[PDB]
Amino acid sequence: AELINQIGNRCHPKLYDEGDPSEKLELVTGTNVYITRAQLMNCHVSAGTRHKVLLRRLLASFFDRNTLANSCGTGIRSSTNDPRRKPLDSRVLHAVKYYCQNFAPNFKESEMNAIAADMCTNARRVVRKSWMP
DNA sequence: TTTACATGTAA
DNA sequence: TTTACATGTAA
């Protein structure tokens, strides 16, 4: 095919393959991280060219608010505040980050970790604390 | 009310 | 310098 030489879009190859929206795509080959075509599509539409928002929508696709609130972001170091906070799932985080650094080669590791920490930080400012003494 | 991005801290 | 973090801001 006349298309092999091209760099191509920096997205999931099957993403635009006309197919079942509920089909589970492996986000990055050999990571065992899956997402539905429809949901990955939804992440890309929402983000457009904003790699920062693409990171945020992918992370919210795997991690709900309570998981985010109880996580220390990437966990390169342990938490400053609450040592019971576990890192966000390391296998999911690497695949998501690898997928976004591949979607936007100027995205740096440290910007990506800073966004992941902010997700958790936002989840904690929203989660309502207990009203017990 | 929520959150993407900004600001600046503590260790 | 780095990184998890709470908070400020704008929409």
Residue numbers in the entry: 345 to 477
In the authors' words:
The BEN domain, which is named after the exemplar proteins BANP, E5R and NACC1 (also known as NAC1), is found in diverse animal and viral proteins and has been shown to constitute a new class of DNA-binding domain (DBD) (1–4). There are nine BEN domain-containing proteins in humans, including BANP, BEND2–7, NACC1 and NACC2. Over the past few years, studies have demonstrated the preferred DNA sequences for some human BEN domain proteins, which can be roughly classified into two groups based on their recognized motifs. In this study, we solved the crystal structures of DNA-bound BEN domains from both BANP and NACC1, which are representative members of each group of BEN domain proteins.
The first group of proteins includes NACC1 and NACC2, both of which recognize sequences containing a conserved CATG motif. To clarify the molecular basis of DNA recognition by NACC1, we solved the crystal structure of the BEN domain of NACC1 in complex with bound 10-bp CATG-containing DNA with a thymine overhang at the 5′ end at a resolution of 2.3 Å. In the structure, the BEN domain of NACC1 contains two β-strands at the N-terminus and five α-helices that fold into a globular structure. In this complex, one NACC1 molecule binds one double-stranded DNA molecule. Sequence-specific DNA recognition is mediated primarily by the C-terminal helix α5 of the NACC1 BEN domain, which inserts into the major groove and contacts the bases inside. Asp462 from α5 forms a hydrogen bond each with the bases of C4 and A5 from one chain of DNA. Thr465 and Arg469 from α5 recognize bases from the other chain of DNA, with Thr465 forming a hydrogen bond with A6′ and Arg469 forming a pair of hydrogen bonds with G4′, respectively. Notably, nearly half of the loop between α3 and α4 hangs over the neighbouring minor groove, with the long side chain of Arg421 from this loop inserting into the narrow minor groove and forming a pair of hydrogen bonds with the base of T10′. Overall, NACC1 covers a length of 10 bp on the DNA substrate. The insertion of the α5 helix widens the CATG-containing major groove by 1–2 Å.
